[PDB]
Amino acid sequence: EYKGHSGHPLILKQEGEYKGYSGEPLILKQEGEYKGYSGTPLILEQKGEYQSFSGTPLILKQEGEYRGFSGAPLILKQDGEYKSFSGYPLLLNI
Amino acid sequence: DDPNKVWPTGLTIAESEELHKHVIDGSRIFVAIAIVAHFLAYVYSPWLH
Amino acid sequence: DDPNKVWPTGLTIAESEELHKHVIDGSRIFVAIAIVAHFLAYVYSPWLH
Amino acid sequence: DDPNKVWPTGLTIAESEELHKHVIDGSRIFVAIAIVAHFLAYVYSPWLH
Amino acid sequence: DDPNKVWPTGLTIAESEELHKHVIDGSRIFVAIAIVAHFLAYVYSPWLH
Amino acid sequence: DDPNKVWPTGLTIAESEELHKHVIDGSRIFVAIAIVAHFLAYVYSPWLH
Amino acid sequence: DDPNKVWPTGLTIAESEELHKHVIDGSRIFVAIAIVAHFLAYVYSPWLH
Amino acid sequence: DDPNKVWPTGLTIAESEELHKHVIDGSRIFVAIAIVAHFLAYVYSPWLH
Amino acid sequence: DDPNKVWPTGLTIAESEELHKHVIDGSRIFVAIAIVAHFLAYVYSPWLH
Amino acid sequence: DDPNKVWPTGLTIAESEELHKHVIDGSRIFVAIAIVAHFLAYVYSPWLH
Amino acid sequence: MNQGRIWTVVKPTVGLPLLLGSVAIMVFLVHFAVLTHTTWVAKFMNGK
Amino acid sequence: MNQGRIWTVVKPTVGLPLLLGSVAIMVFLVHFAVLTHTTWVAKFMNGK
Amino acid sequence: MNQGRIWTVVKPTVGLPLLLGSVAIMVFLVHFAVLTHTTWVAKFMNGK
Amino acid sequence: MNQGRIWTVVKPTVGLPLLLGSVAIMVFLVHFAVLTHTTWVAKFMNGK
Amino acid sequence: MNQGRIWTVVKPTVGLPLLLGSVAIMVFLVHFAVLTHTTWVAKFMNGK
Amino acid sequence: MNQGRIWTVVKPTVGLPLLLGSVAIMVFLVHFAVLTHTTWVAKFMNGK
Amino acid sequence: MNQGRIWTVVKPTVGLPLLLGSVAIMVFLVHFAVLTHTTWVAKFMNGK
Amino acid sequence: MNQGRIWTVVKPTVGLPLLLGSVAIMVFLVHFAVLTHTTWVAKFMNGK
Amino acid sequence: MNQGRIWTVVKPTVGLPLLLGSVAIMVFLVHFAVLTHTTWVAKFMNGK
Ligand code: BCL
Ligand code: BCL
Ligand code: BCL
Ligand code: BCL
Ligand code: BCL
Ligand code: BCL
Ligand SMILES: CC(C)=C/C=C/C(C)=C/C=C/C(C)=C/C=C/C(C)=C/C=C/C=C(C)/C=C/C=C(C)/C=C/C=C(\C)CCCC(C)(C)O
Ligand SMILES: CC(C)=C/C=C/C(C)=C/C=C/C(C)=C/C=C/C(C)=C/C=C/C=C(C)/C=C/C=C(C)/C=C/C=C(\C)CCCC(C)(C)O
Ligand SMILES: CC(C)=C/C=C/C(C)=C/C=C/C(C)=C/C=C/C(C)=C/C=C/C=C(C)/C=C/C=C(C)/C=C/C=C(\C)CCCC(C)(C)O
Ligand SMILES: CC(C)=C/C=C/C(C)=C/C=C/C(C)=C/C=C/C(C)=C/C=C/C=C(C)/C=C/C=C(C)/C=C/C=C(\C)CCCC(C)(C)O
Ligand SMILES: CC(C)=C/C=C/C(C)=C/C=C/C(C)=C/C=C/C(C)=C/C=C/C=C(C)/C=C/C=C(C)/C=C/C=C(\C)CCCC(C)(C)O
C-alpha cells in the first residue's frame, strides 16, 4: 500500500453502495416508458415514408445518369493517357 | 431484420427514438428555464423598456 | 443488384435518399424561420428604411 | 437478459446509473460550494449592495 | 480488370467520374449565383461607379 | 467476480483505488505548497494589507 | 515484381507519375492565371507605376 | 507475478521506475541550471535590488 | 539480412537514402532561388544600403 | 535476450543509441552555428556594447 | 420530435457531447456578446 | 434535392455533425458581424 | 437524476473528462469575464 | 472536368467535406474582408 | 477520496495527463490574470 | 517534374488535400497582407 | 521519486513528450511574461 | 547529406508533408515579419 | 549523451518530428520576441 507524505487515510470506500454526501435520492429509476417532465408527446412516430413538412416533392428522383442543371458536358473523358492543357512534357523520368 | 435492424451506431430505431426522447425533454426544460430568465431580464434589465 | 448495394458508408441509395429527405426538409424549415426573422428585422430595424 | 445487456460503452444500465450517482453527488457538492462563494461575495463585495 | 478496378478509395473510375459530375455541376451553379450577386453589387453598391 | 473483475481501462477496483491514492496525496502536497505561497503573499504582497 | 511493386501508398510508380502529371498541369494552369492577374494589377493598380 | 507483470503500457514496474530515474535526474539537472540562472539574474538584473 | 531489412516505415536503407537525395537536391534548389531573391533585395531594396 | 530485445518502438537498444548519436551530433552543430550567430550579433549589434 | 432516428446514423458518443458542448459554448458566446455590447450587465456585475 | 446520394459516400456521423455545426457556427459569425458593425443592435441590447 | 443511462451510450472515458474539463474551462471564463468587466476584483487583487 | 478521377485517390468522405467547408470558409473570409475594409457594407447593415 | 473508482472507467493514460496538464495550464492562467490586473507583481518583476 | 514518385511515399489522400488546401490558405494570406498594407485595394473595394 | 510507477499507467511515448513539451512551452510563457511586464529585459535586448 | 537514414525511422508520409508544410509556414512568417517591421515593403506594395 | 535509450520508449516517428518542429517553432519565437522588443532589428530590416 502507498504511504504518501500527507497523512492517513488517503481514500474512502464502502461495500454496499455509493455513500454520497449530498443526501438521497441521488438518482431516479425507470421501470418502463420514459417519464418526461415537459408533457407528452415527446417524439412523433413514423410508420412508413417520411411524412415531411414544408410540402412535397422533397427530393428529386434519379433513375439513370446524372442530369446537370448547367448544361452538358459536365466531364471530359480520358483514354490512353492524360492530355496536357499546358504542353509537353509534363514530367521528367529516368 | 428491418424493424429490429441494429444500425451502425449499435442502436435500433426504438433505442434511437428512446434516446431522442431525452433530447427533446431536455430541450423543452432548457427553453422553459430560458423563458423565465428572459422574463427576469424583462422585469429587471432596461432591455425592452 | 445496383439498388441494393451497401456503399462504403454502410447505407443503400434508398437509405441515403431517405436521410437526405430529412436534410432538405430541415433546410426548408430553417429558411422559413429565417424569412420571418428578416421580415421582423425589416419591420422593426432601420435596415432597409 | 435485458438488465444484463452490456451496452456499446461496456457498461450495464446498473453500472451507468451507479456512475451517474457520483455525477449527481459531485454536481450537488459543486453547487453548495458555489452558493457559499456567492454568499461571501454578497457579504464582501459591492455586487448586490 | 482496370475499367472495373476498385481503387483504394472504394470507387471505380466510373463512380469517381459520376461523383465528380456533381462537383462540376455544383461549381457551375455556385458561379452562376455569384455572378448575379456581383451584378447586384454593381447595380446597388458604389463598387465600380 | 467484482473484486477481481478487470474493467475496460485494464485496472481492477483495487488498482484504481491504489492509483487514486497517489492522486489524493499529490493533491494534498500541492495544496500544502500553495498555502505556504499564500502565506508568503500575505506577508510580502499588498494583497490583504 | 520490381517495376510492378505496389508501394505503401497503394500506388505503382506509373500510377504515381500519372497522378503527378495532373499536379504539374494544375500548377502550370495556376501560374498562367496568376500571370494574367499580375498583368491586370500592373495595368490597373499603382503597383509598379 | 507482480514484479514480472507487463502493465498496459508494456513496461514492468522495474522498467517503469528505471525510466522515472531518468525523469528525476533530468529534473534535478534542470533545477540546478535554473538556480544558476536565478543567481545570475540576482547579480546582474535589478530583480531583488 | 541487414541491407535488405524493411524498416517499420516500409523502406529499406537504400530507398531511404534515395528519397533523402531528393530532399537534399530540393534544399539546394531552394537555397539557390533564395540567394537570388536576397541578391535582388540587396539591389532594389534599401536593406543594406 | 536482453541486449537483443526489440522494444515497443521497434528498435533495439543499439539501434536506439545509434539513432541518438545523430541527435546529439545535430545538437552540437546547431549549438556551433548558434554560437557564431551570437558572436556576429555581438560584433555588429548594440547588444552588449 | 420527428428526428428521433438521427441516432441510428450519428453515434451518440459523438452527437450528444457535440450537442451539449455546442449549446454550452454558444450560451457563453451570447453572454460575452451582451456583456461586451451593453453597459447594464457590467454595471450589474460592478454593483455599488 | 438531387444530392441525396451524398450519404452513400460521406459518412453521416461525420457530415451531419459538420453540416449542423457549420450552420450554427456561421449563424453566430453573421450575428457577430452585424452586432459589431451596427449601432442599432447594441442599442436594442442596451435598451433604456 | 433521470439521465443516469447517458453512460450506456456516451463512453465514460470521453464524457467524464469532457464534463469536468468543460466546467473547469467555463468556471475560468466566468472569472475572466467578471475580472475584466469590474473594478472591485482588480482592487481586491491589487490590495493596498 | 478532366480531374474526374480525383475520387479514386482522395476519399470522398474526406475531400467533399473539405471542399464544401473550405468554400464556406472562403466565402466568409471575403465577406469579413469587404465588411471591414469598406464603409458601404456597414452603412447598408446600419440602415437608416 | 471516495472517487477512487474513476480510473476503472477513465483511462489513466488519458485522465492523468489531462489532470496534470489542466492544473498546470490553469496555474498559468491565474498567474497571468494577477500579473495583468495588478501593479505590484510587475513592480516585483521590474525590481529597482 | 522530377518529383513524380512522391506519391509512392506520401499518400495521395493526405498530400493532395494538403497541397490544394495549403495553396488556398496562402492565396488568402497574400490577399489579406496586401489588403491591410495598402490603400488602393480598400479604395477599389470601397469604390465611389 | 515515489511516483516511479506512473509509467505503468501512462504511456511513455505520450507522457514524456507531453512532459518535455509542456516544460518548454511554459518556460517560454515565463520569458514572455517577464519580457512584456518589465523594462530591464527589453533594455538588455536593445543594448546600446 | 548524412541524415538519409531518417526515413527508416520517420514515416515519409509524415515527415515530408511536415517538412514542406513547415518551410511554407515559416517562409510566410518571415514575409509577415519583414512586412510589418519595415516601410519599404509596404511602399513597394502601395506603389504610386 | 546518456539519454539514448529514450528511443526505446518514445517512437522516433513521434519524437523526432516533435523535436525538430519544437526547435524550429521556438527559434521563431525568440526571433519574434527580440524583433518586437528592440529597435535595432527593425532598423536593420528597414535599412537605409
Ligand atoms: C503538513 C505536511 C503534510 C501533511 C502531513 C500530515 C501528518 C504529519 C499527519 C497528517 C494527518 C492527516 N492529514 Mg495530512 N498533510 C498535509 C496535507 C493534508 C491536507 C491538505 C488539503 O493539504 C489534508 C486534507 C490532509 C488530511 C489529513 C487527515 C486525513 C489527517 C488528520 C488531520 C489532523 O487534524 O491531524 C492532526 C493535526 C496535524 C497533523 C497538524 C498540526 C499543526 C500544528 C498545530 C502546527 C504545526 C506548525 C509547523 C511546525 C510549522 C512549520 C513547518 C511546515 C510549514 C508545516 N493532509 C501536508 C502535505 N498529515 C495525520 C494522520 O495521518 O493521522 C492518522 C497526521 O498526523
Ligand atoms: C449541506 C451539505 C450537502 C447536503 C447534505 C444533505 C443532508 C445532510 C441531507 C440532504 C438531503 C437532501 N438533499 Mg443534499 N446536500 C447538499 C447539496 C444538495 C443539493 C444542491 C444543488 O446543492 C441538492 C438539490 C440536494 C438534494 C437533497 C434532497 C434529495 C434532500 C432533501 C432536501 C433538503 O432539505 O436537504 C437538506 C438541505 C439542504 C441540502 C440545503 C438547505 C439550504 C438552505 C437554503 C440554507 C441552509 C443554511 C445552513 C443551515 C447554514 C449552516 C450550516 C452550514 C454552514 C451549511 N442536496 C450539500 C452538498 N442533503 C436530506 C435527505 O433527504 O437525505 C436523505 C438530508 O438529510
Ligand atoms: C412548464 C413546466 C414544463 C412543462 C410541463 C408540462 C405539463 C405539466 C404538461 C405539458 C404539456 C405539453 N407540453 Mg410541456 N412543459 C415545459 C416545456 C415545454 C415546451 C418548451 C419548448 O418549453 C414545449 C414545446 C412543450 C410541449 C408540450 C406539449 C407536448 C403539451 C401541450 C402544450 C400545452 O399547451 O399544454 C397546456 C399548457 C401548458 C402546459 C402551459 C401552462 C403555462 C401556465 C401559465 C403555467 C404552468 C405552471 C407550471 C405547470 C408549474 C410547475 C412547474 C414549475 C414550478 C414552473 N413543453 C416545461 C419544461 N408540459 C401538457 C400536455 O398536454 O400533457 C399531456 C401538460 O399537461
Ligand atoms: C410555409 C410553411 C412551410 C411550408 C408549407 C407548405 C405547404 C402547406 C405546401 C408546400 C408546398 C410546396 N413547398 Mg413548402 N413550406 C415551407 C417552406 C418551403 C421552402 C423554403 C425554402 O422555405 C421551399 C423551397 C418549399 C417548397 C415547396 C414546393 C415543393 C411546393 C410548391 C410551392 C408552393 O407554392 O407551395 C405553397 C407555398 C409556399 C411554400 C409559400 C407560401 C408563402 C406565403 C406567401 C406566406 C404564408 C404566410 C403564413 C400564412 C404565415 C403564418 C403561418 C406560419 C407562421 C407559416 N417549401 C415552410 C417550412 N409547402 C405545397 C405542396 O407540396 O403541396 C403538396 C403546399 O401546398
Ligand atoms: C443559367 C443556368 C445554368 C446554365 C444553363 C445551361 C443551358 C440551358 C445550357 C448550358 C450549356 C452549356 N453550359 Mg451551362 N449553365 C450554367 C452554368 C454554367 C457555367 C458557369 C461557370 O456558370 C459554365 C462554364 C457552363 C458550361 C456550359 C457549356 C458546357 C455549355 C455551352 C455554353 C454556351 O455558351 O452555351 C450557349 C449559351 C448559354 C446556354 C447561356 C449564355 C448565358 C450568358 C452568357 C449570360 C446570361 C446571364 C443571365 C442574365 C443571368 C441571370 C438570369 C438567371 C437568374 C440565371 N454552364 C447555369 C448554372 N448551360 C448548353 C449546352 O451545351 O447544353 C447541352 C445549354 O444548352
Ligand atoms: C498559355 C496556355 C497554357 C500553355 C500552353 C502551351 C502550348 C500551346 C504549348 C506549350 C508547351 C510547353 N509548355 Mg505550356 N502552357 C501554359 C503553362 C506553362 C508553364 C507555366 C509555368 O505557366 C510552363 C513552364 C509550361 C511548360 C511548357 C513546356 C513543357 C513546353 C515548351 C514551352 C515553350 O517555351 O515553347 C515555345 C513557346 C511557346 C509554345 C509559346 C509561344 C507564345 C506566342 C509567342 C504568343 C501566342 C499568343 C496567343 C495567340 C494568344 C491567344 C491564345 C492563348 C491565350 C495562348 N507551360 C498554360 C497553362 N504550352 C509547348 C509544347 O509542349 O509543345 C509540344 C506548346 O506548344
Ligand atoms: C452572438 C449574438 C449576438 C447572437 C447569436 C444568438 C443566437 C444565434 C442564439 C442561438 C441559440 C440557439 C440555437 C440555441 C439552441 C439551444 C438548444 C438546441 C438546446 C438544446 C438542449 C438540449 C439538451 C438539454 C439535451 C439533453 C439531452 C440529454 C439529457 C440526453 C440524455 C440521454 C440519455 C440518458 C441516453 C439514453 C439512452 C437509452 C438507450 C435510451 O437508454
Ligand atoms: C483566472 C481567475 C482570475 C480566476 C480563476 C481561479 C480558479 C477558478 C482557480 C481554480 C483552481 C483549481 C480548480 C485548482 C485545482 C488544483 C488541483 C485539483 C490540483 C491537483 C493536483 C494533483 C496532483 C499533483 C496529482 C498527482 C498525481 C500523481 C503523482 C499520480 C501518480 C500515479 C502513479 C505513480 C501511478 C500508480 C500506479 C499503481 C499501479 C497504482 O502503482
Ligand atoms: C504574406 C506575404 C506578404 C508574402 C508571402 C508571399 C509568398 C511566400 C507566396 C508564396 C506562394 C507560393 C509558394 C505559391 C505556390 C503555388 C503552387 C505550388 C500552386 C500549385 C497548384 C497546384 C494545383 C492546382 C494542383 C492540382 C492538382 C490536381 C487537380 C490533381 C488531380 C489528381 C487527380 C485527378 C487524380 C489522378 C489519379 C490517377 C490514378 C492518375 O488517374
Ligand atoms: C505566467 C507567470 C507570470 C508565472 C507562472 C510561473 C510558473 C507557474 C512556473 C512554473 C514552473 C514549473 C511548474 C516548472 C516545472 C518544471 C519541471 C517539472 C521540469 C522537469 C524537467 C524534466 C526533465 C528534464 C526530464 C527529462 C527526462 C529524460 C531525459 C528521460 C529519459 C528517458 C529515457 C532515457 C528512457 C529510459 C528507458 C529505459 C529502458 C528505462 O532505460
Ligand atoms: C521568449 C523569450 C524572450 C525568450 C525565450 C528563450 C528560450 C527559453 C530559449 C530556449 C532555447 C532552447 C531550449 C533551445 C534548444 C535547442 C535544441 C534542444 C536544439 C536541438 C537540435 C537538434 C537537432 C538538430 C537534431 C537533429 C537530429 C537528426 C539529424 C536526426 C537524425 C536521425 C537519423 C538519420 C536516423 C538514424 C537511424 C539509425 C538507426 C541510426 O539508422
Numbering used by the authors:
A (entry chain S): 4 to 97
B (entry chain R), C (entry chain B), D (entry chain P), E (entry chain D), F (entry chain N), G (entry chain F), ...: 3 to 51
K (entry chain Q), L (entry chain A), M (entry chain O), N (entry chain C), O (entry chain M), P (entry chain E), ...: 1 to 48
Q: Which text from the study accompanies this structure?
A:
LH2 complexes are oligomers of a basic α/β-apoprotein dimer, each of which binds noncovalently three molecules of bacteriochlorophyll a (BChl a) and one or two molecules of carotenoids. Light energy absorbed by LH2 is rapidly and efficiently transferred via LH1 to the reaction centers, where it is trapped in the primary charge separation reactions. Overall, the cryo-EM maps and the corresponding models of the four LH2 complexes are very similar, all with a ring-like structure in which nine α/β-heterodimers oligomerize to form a nonameric complex. The most unusual structural feature of these four LH2 complexes is the hitherto unknown γ-polypeptide, which partially encircles the LH2 complex toward its cytoplasmic side.
